[PDB]
Design a protein around this ligand. Structure first.
Ligand code: CHL
Ligand code: CLA
Ligand code: CLA
Ligand code: CLA
Ligand code: CLA
Ligand code: CLA
Ligand SMILES: CCCCCCCCCCCCCCCCCCCC(=O)O[C@H](COC(=O)CCCCCCCCCCCCCC)COP(=O)(O)OCCN
Ligand SMILES: CC1=C(/C=C/C(C)=C/C=C/C(C)=C/C=C/C=C(C)/C=C/C=C(C)/C=C/C2=C(C)C(=O)[C@@H](O)CC2(C)C)C(C)(C)C[C@H](O)C1=O
Ligand SMILES: CC1=C[C@H](O)CC(C)(C)[C@H]1/C=C/C(C)=C/C=C/C(C)=C/C=C/C=C(C)/C=C/C=C(C)/C=C/C1=C(C)C[C@H](O)CC1(C)C
Ligand SMILES: CC1=C[C@H](O)CC(C)(C)[C@H]1/C=C/C(C)=C/C=C/C(C)=C/C=C/C=C(C)/C=C/C=C(C)/C=C/C1=C(C)C[C@H](O)CC1(C)C
Ligand SMILES: CC1=C[C@H](O)CC(C)(C)[C@H]1/C=C/C(C)=C/C=C/C(C)=C/C=C/C=C(C)/C=C/C=C(C)/C=C/C1=C(C)C[C@H](O)CC1(C)C
Ligand SMILES: CC(=O)/C=C/C=C(C)/C=C/[C@H]1[C@H](C)CCCC1(C)C
Lengths: 41, 192, 219, 165, 207
């Protein structure tokens, strides 16, 4: 189990997971808050 | 000392031999000797100026010549300043310049003297020469009268800023109705 | 050391220990690792807490009196505008500049005190009043002129307790002011109005129904 | 109006653009049923287009002669005319998030640089440490300013390798 | 243990037998700090004595208002004293009270700061000091013997009066009429009139 978690912590796996999480978060932000041209607060 | 300010308190030691000293210094502003000397001179000077101011404020009113608050009013909105029921031919600019020059010279000559001479300068300033012969009691009376006059001047200013009448009218109004005419009735001093 | 911590079971960071008032070992972001930075943050916390206490008092006490009936004052968010439309109202720019000019002098002097506590006590700096500008050794707690009644001067432990009470009240007032800002922005009502509305129906009147905290897009 | 720009609310070209886009969408919608999947998708697109145009006109954006929104990138000019949310506020937001990520990476690199084997820590990231540093990176402005005023945020020029000129 | 046979004295009250009414009651440990307990003792004495005077005044005024003895001034509820007219208005009386209380309370505070210091009047008259919370104002010399028993009576009556005032205020805010009228309304049944049916304390019952 330790070796598996160590493999999941490698640079490529972590890079792909981080990019996927960031892309998913951005996609959902644009899905619920679309066409945000300016920062209207 | 002759006094204790707070009957059961412990007055400071540096205020034990000074005249008109009640040990009043809870904030400890006279802990340093230099500050104490400067404050002593300032207190005596303030008392003298306040006594003169209170005497003038009462005199101009009891003599039916006008109030202290409206004294510079005729000069503004036109001109002409009255004195003793006469007329002085001077404007605000000339009056300010004359007073500035006279006061600047007097204070400059007074402030450049020795520390003791800056608050108690005998000689030419005592024509009657009554300073000699135990001046401690006289100094105490002077300081106390100055403190009372300072409080009186502050009272004139605050009372006029609150009610709006001059000293004599305020005194007469309070004497007429001492129960419903005081600082508690006006909607400024006591809010609730 | 063994004093209560913010999160029971979690050890306090070594950079905090337990000497500053209000020390509960709360620093998840490790912002106060540097000693100089920690000192500056301590002074900033004291200043923010005191100003927040004054503001929250000036916002709650007048509102409570107004609710009763005695002393009628406008709501804190409209107090600035109410005075603007007054007759002899001072211009906003001039008023702000005067306040900033006075605060410049006092705040710069306090700034010099932070760098060196006995800085303002330099002989001859003022007209004999510099003697009362010497701190107590810790920036942010200046006796002399301040603290005229001498509260907490009986002993060192008495002053420590008062410091803890001051820090807790300051933090509570800071959180309260942030709540006031958020409540007024979310609901155009006063703090007392919000409290009264919540007690009437807590499950139907709270931040989950104001329409601002929870975005309508998600629902 | 800032530089000869007309607000999108009173812009005729903006309204014409919205009308044309909705018209094209309805023309495409006319070739389907009333409750079919393509019809529902086209109706949703029409609603989104109308909402977008209404929001742009309501937000106070400035439109040019072409009828498209224009952004004002100048403090003062955008602050006094109510356009701070065009570039100013987004600039602050970016700078904050960018500094957060950069500070988290810097702290992680400096923390693992003290380990006996830092290269492995670079190819095999320490998830718990990275998570803690990512959380700590949110206070990056305060930490960065403190390190700058402390002198620990910089390396002495005499300690950095340099070319032989 | 005095207030609860199953409880234990909070240690800070076990070695304090000089305190009037010491029953080891401090579940919140508010008096753990010696200075805090010293201040709380004076606060308790002040609150108790003021409560005794206030409760006695309210009870006597209501008794005269119900039975009928006092003039038009007494024939009014205690909370309605503002409707009456006296020699001076409310503001003047309030200001006079503030000044007199400032003088008396500052004398008391000076004594608290240093017991036995402020005990002399400006005319030289002196009195014998007997403990902090007991300045010695005993013109009848009742403290010459059984001082502990007398102070125990005082502390118990003071606590009872404090509770009585709190109850009077609560009843006024929940029930109509004067305290004596509320007592009579209770004694009328008394199985129905007892805060449970007042519609204010339970709140959950009938809104
Ligand atoms: C201590 C400070 C002091 C000051 C600043 C003033 C200032 C003033 N007093 Mg004055 N007084 C003062 C003290 C006194 N006054 C008076 C009695 C009066 C009266 C009766 C009147 C004034 C008036 C005036 C005003 C006339 C302007 C002026 O200076 O004309 C020029 C004055 C001089 C050149 C004086 C020269 C004196 C020198 C020869 C000795 C003026 C604002 C007049 C006023 O208010 O009119 C509207 C007025 O009628 N004062 C007395 C005696 C009780 C004072 C005692 O200290
Ligand atoms: C530096 C270049 C740049 C910049 C400044 C922008 C800026 C913007 N784009 Mg754009 N885009 C770009 C490049 C860029 N884009 C490129 C190269 C492409 C081709 C792939 C696109 C394709 C694209 C599309 C298809 C869309 C946008 C949209 C947007 C707007 C949406 C803002 C938002 O997401 O809401 C707010 C987001 C947040 C508040 C998240 C902030 C917190 C994050 C998670 C931090 C990230 C940390 C790492 C915004 C003004 C959308 C839009 O509506 O246009 C107006 C949209 O539909 N872009
Ligand atoms: C990045 C470069 C840059 C440029 C080219 C400009 C250009 C301009 N600014 Mg500006 N500004 C900038 C940066 C810049 N700013 C930054 C970084 C800030 C934040 C401190 C500001 C804050 C600011 C304010 C508050 C104002 C301007 C204003 C202006 C306009 C007139 C002022 C002027 O230039 O008179 C001469 C400049 C001298 C130094 C002389 C002008 C077009 C003014 C404006 O809005 O116009 C009405 C205005 O009041 N700016
Ligand atoms: C701290 C204690 C206290 C306080 C604040 C008051 C306050 C008051 N009493 Mg009270 N009273 C007290 C103790 C107190 N009493 C006690 C112990 C008794 C029992 C003897 C009474 C018996 C009593 C009666 C019978 C009446 C009052 C009345 C009043 C009211 C007007 C009294 C007045 O004109 O002033 C005093 C005037 C001078 C000192 C001069 C006033 C609100 C009168 C009232 O207005 O009824 C509402 C009234 O008739 N009092
Ligand atoms: C010790 C507390 C106390 C206090 C503060 C007061 C205060 C007051 N009483 Mg009262 N009184 C008290 C005890 C007290 N009383 C007791 C114990 C009794 C029963 C013996 C009375 C019986 C009594 C009567 C019969 C009257 C007052 C009246 C008054 C009011 C005016 C008194 C006056 O000027 O003379 C009297 C003024 C006359 C015009 C007569 C006054 C506010 C008088 C009043 O109510 O004012 C109209 C009044 O008629 N008292
Ligand atoms: C100081 C002793 C004391 C005494 C002798 C009384 C006596 C009385 N109270 Mg009272 N009360 C007291 C204290 C006291 N109370 C305190 C400290 C409070 C604040 C919680 C209250 C709050 C209160 C309310 C809200 C009501 C009464 C009511 C009453 C009357 C009906 C009995 C009852 O329900 O009481 C209730 C007793 C308590 C709530 C606690 C008493 C404390 C202990 C048990 C005393 C021993 C009665 C004559 C009721 C009334 O007005 O009659 C119609 C009524 O509604 N009391
Ligand atoms: C109301 C009007 C009151 C005006 C009174 C002014 C008197 C000023 C004299 C002060 C003085 O004599 O001080 C001298 C200063 O030496 C010096 O330097 C000489 C200065 C004298 C200036 C001349 C003043 C004339 C103007 C008077 C207008 C009236 C002596 O020396 P000292 O400092 O020890 O003072 C001790 C004097 N007892
Ligand atoms: C369980 C659990 C986890 C949870 C961690 C959380 C979550 C912590 C929460 C912090 C806060 C402070 C949450 C606030 C949480 C508060 C709220 C309110 C959350 C969601 C509510 C929504 C989405 C509804 C909105 C509505 C809309 C928009 C409408 O239209 C109107 O009708 C009104 C209304 C009905 C309100 C874990 C990680 C430990 C471990 C596992 O993974 C699991
Ligand atoms: C000591 C201490 C210490 C501690 O520790 C702390 C503490 C507390 C702070 C303290 C205290 C303090 C105090 C009390 C103060 C006060 C002061 C004053 C009041 C002054 C006045 C003062 C005052 C003054 C000078 C005044 C003056 C006046 C005058 C000139 C007048 C004039 C005039 C006249 C004639 C008339 C005319 O027609 C008008 C005029 C023109 C107007
Ligand atoms: C600790 C820590 C550490 C870790 O590591 C991290 C973290 C987590 C981040 C942290 C936390 C933090 C926090 C919480 C903060 C907050 C703060 C605040 C809230 C402040 C305020 C603060 C606040 C303040 C000052 C305020 C003040 C106020 C005022 C003056 C007011 C005023 C007013 C008045 C009177 C009235 C009128 O009519 C109006 C006005 C004008 C309005
Ligand atoms: C001990 C402890 C400890 C542990 O650990 C914890 C715990 C549990 C918390 C505790 C407990 C506590 C408590 C219970 C407290 C309470 C107190 C009170 C009640 C006070 C009152 C107190 C009260 C008081 C002062 C009162 C006073 C009153 C008075 C003056 C009155 C006056 C009057 C009169 C004559 C008549 C008229 O027509 C009206 C008036 C003008 C109104
Ligand atoms: C307003 C302005 O521009 C200058 C004012 C100067 C003063 C008061 C100087 C006063 C003295 C002091 C305290 C030191 C020695 C010289 C003086 C005249 C006695």
């Amino acid at each position: 189990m330790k070796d598996f978690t160590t493999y999941l912590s490698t640079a490529p796996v972590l890079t792909l997971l981080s990019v996927t999480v960031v892309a998913g978060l951005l996609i959902e932000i644009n899905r619920f808050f679309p066409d945000a041209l300016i920062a209207a607060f | 000392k002759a006094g204790n300010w707070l009957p059961g308190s412990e007055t400071p030691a540096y205020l034990e031999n000074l005249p008109a000293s009640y040990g009043f210094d809870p904030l400890g502003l006279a802990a340093e000797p230099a500050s104490l000397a400067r404050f002593r001179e300032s207190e005596v000077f303030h008392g003298r100026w306040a006594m003169l101011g209170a005497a003038g404020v009462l005199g101009v009113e009891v003599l039916g010549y006008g109030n202290w608050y409206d004294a510079p009013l005729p000069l503004v909105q036109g001109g002409q300043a009255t004195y003793f029921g006469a007329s002085v031919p001077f404007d605000l600019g000339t009056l300010a310049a004359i007073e500035f020059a006279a006061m600047a010279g007097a204070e400059s000559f007074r402030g450049a003297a020795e520390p003791e001479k800056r608050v108690y300068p005998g000689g030419a300033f005592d024509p009657m020469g009554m300073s000699k012969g135990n001046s401690k009691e006289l100094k105490t009376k002077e300081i106390k009268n100055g403190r009372l006059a300072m409080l009186a001047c502050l009272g004139f200013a605050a009372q006029h800023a609150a009610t709006g009448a001059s000293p004599l009218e305020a005194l007469a109004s309070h004497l007429a109705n001492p129960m419903a005419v005081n600082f508690a009735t006006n909607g400024v001093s006591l809010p609730l | 050391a063994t004093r209560p911590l913010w999160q029971p079971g979690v050890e306090a960071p070594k950079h905090l220990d337990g000497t500053m008032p209000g020390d509960f070992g709360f620093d998840p972001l490790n912002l106060g690792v540097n000693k100089e930075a920690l000192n500056w943050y301590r002074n900033a916390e004291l200043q923010n807490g005191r100003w927040a206490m004054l503001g929250v008092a000036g916002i709650v006490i007048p509102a409570e009196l107004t609710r009763v009936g005695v002393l009628n004052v406008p709501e804190w968010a409209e107090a600035g505008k109410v005075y603007a439309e007054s007759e002899n109202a001072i211009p906003f720019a001039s008023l702000l500049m005067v306040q900033l000019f006075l605060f410049n002098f006092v705040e710069i002097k306090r700034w010099e005190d932070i760098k060196k506590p006995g800085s303002q006590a330099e002989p001859g700096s003022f007209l004999g009043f510099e003697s009362g500008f010497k701190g107590t050794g810790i920036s942010g707690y200046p006796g002399g002129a301040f603290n005229p009644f001498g509260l907490g001067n009986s002993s060192k432990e008495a002053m420590d307790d008062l410091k803890w009470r001051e820090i807790r009240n300051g933090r509570l007032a800071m959180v309260a002011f942030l709540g006031f800002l958020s409540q007024h922005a979310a609901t155009g009502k006063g703090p007392l109005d919000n409290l009264a509305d919540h007690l009437a129906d807590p499950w139907g009147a709270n931040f989950c129904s104001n329409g601002v905290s929870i975005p309508s897009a998600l629902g | 109006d800032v530089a000869g720009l007309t607000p999108c609310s009173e812009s005729k070209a903006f309204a014409k653009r919205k009308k044309n886009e909705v018209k094209a969408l309805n023309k495409r919608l006319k070739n389907y049923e009333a409750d079919s999947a393509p019809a529902l998708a086209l109706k949703a697109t029409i609603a989104r287009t109308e909402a977008r145009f209404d929001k742009y006109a309501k937000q106070g954006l400035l439109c040019g002669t072409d009828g498209l929104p224009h952004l004002i990138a100048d403090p003062g000019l955008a602050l006094r005319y109510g356009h701070a949310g065009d570039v100013f506020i987004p600039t602050i937001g970016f700078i904050y998030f960018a500094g957060w990520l950069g500070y988290a990476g810097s702290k992680y690199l400096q923390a693992v640089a003290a380990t006996a084997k830092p290269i492995e820590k670079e190819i095999i990231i320490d998830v718990p440490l990275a998570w803690k540093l990512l959380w700590e990176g949110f206070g990056w402005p305060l930490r960065a300013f403190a390190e700058y005023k402390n002198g620990s945020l910089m390396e002495d020029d005499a300690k950095i390798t340099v070319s032989p000129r | 243990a005095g207030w609860d046979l199953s409880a234990e004295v909070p240690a800070h009250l076990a070695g304090r037998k000089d305190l009037a009414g010491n029953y080891g009651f401090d579940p919140l440990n508010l008096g753990k700090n010696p200075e805090a307990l010293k201040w709380y003792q004076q606060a308790e004495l002040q609150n108790g004595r003021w409560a005794m005077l206030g409760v006695a005044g309210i009870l006597v005024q209501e008794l005269l208002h119900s039975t009928g003895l006092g003039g038009k001034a007494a024939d009014v509820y205690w909370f309605d004293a503002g409707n009456n007219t006296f020699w001076a208005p409310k503001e003047t009386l309030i200001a006079i009270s503030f000044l007199m209380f400032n003088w008396a309370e500052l004398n008391r505070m000076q004594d608290y700061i240093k017991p036995g210091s402020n005990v002399t009047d400006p005319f030289g008259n002196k009195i014998k000091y007997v403990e902090l919370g007991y300045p010695g104002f005993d013109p009848l010399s009742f403290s010459k013997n059984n001082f502990d028993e007398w102070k125990l009576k005082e502390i118990k009556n003071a606590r009872l009066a404090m509770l009585a005032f709190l109850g009077i205020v609560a009843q006024h805010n929940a029930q109509p009429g004067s305290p004596l009228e509320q007592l009579g309304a209770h004694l009328a049944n008394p199985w129905k009139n007892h805060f449970i049916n007042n519609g204010v304390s339970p709140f959950l019952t009938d809104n």
